[PDB]
Design a protein around this ligand. Structure first.
Ligand code: HEM
Ligand SMILES: O=P([O-])(O)O
Ligand SMILES: [N+]
Length: 184
């Protein structure tokens, strides 16, 4: 089960966050981890298209080379807090799994500046909650978490030490498709 007491950062700037560009997950903390261990890579691009907030997602497994995409229309619950009803698609936007009622994820932007951010996400699939996941994002895939994002991890009562880095993970990203899924 997830947490819904994640606090959106005060004075969160929507225009810079949803600029249509890519965010790399450089470090993450999964509270409910699988039995089998799988180290992932993930990136996302949040923007606007046709007048709606949109977020496209990318997950890459460096050990199997398996890759999946998702596109969702976002619904703002309160600035910095959003609900995403996702659909799994191919990189060209063809739908593999349609939008389903029990399928969504919500995320809170806990901290964000021009180059970094700390978010909380809760994945819900088939009316089954799947557990809290905290992620540190950066607009550059090689940058280490700075003092500001680290203070934000502390302020949410977490230990940055428990965070796992994707830096030495052999990650490969497909930004072109990420950005283009924004309109699908
Ligand atoms: C902001 C970052 C993330 C968001 C919003 C997010 C969202 C999601 C969504 C929507 C799915 C469902 C895919 C589908 O079936 O269509 C998913 C699945 C998955 N994600 Fe992520 N994810 C994020 C980061 C990560 C990271 C860094 C990891 C590593 C812990 C991860 C590991 C997985 C795995 C293993 C699955 C498959 C379902 C399971 O076994 O629980 N994701 N993610
Ligand atoms: O602008 P910062 O987050 O790199 O200090
Ligand atoms: N996840």
């Amino acid at each position: 089960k997830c947490t819904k007491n994640a606090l959106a950062q005060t004075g969160f700037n929507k225009d810079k966050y949803f600029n249509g560009d890519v965010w790399y997950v450089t470090d993450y903390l999964d509270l409910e981890p699988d039995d089998v261990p799988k180290r992932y890579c993930a990136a996302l691009a949040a923007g606007t298209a046709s007048g709606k907030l949109k977020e496209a997602l990318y997950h890459y497994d460096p050990k199997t080379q398996d890759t999946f995409y998702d596109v969702s229309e976002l619904q703002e619950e309160s600035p910095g807090k959003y609900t995403a009803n996702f659909k799994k698609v191919e990189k060209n936007g063809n739908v593999k799994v349609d939008v389903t009622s029990g399928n969504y994820y919500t995320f809170t932007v806990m901290y964000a500046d021009d180059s970094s951010a700390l978010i909380h996400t809760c994945l819900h699939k088939g009316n089954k909650d799947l557990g809290d996941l905290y992620a540190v994002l950066n607009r550059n895939k090689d940058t280490n978490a700075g003092d500001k994002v680290k203070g934000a991890v502390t302020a949410a009562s977490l230990k940055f030490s428990d965070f796992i880095s994707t830096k030495d993970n052999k990650c490969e990203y497909d930004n072109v498709s990420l950005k283009s899924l924004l309109t699908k």
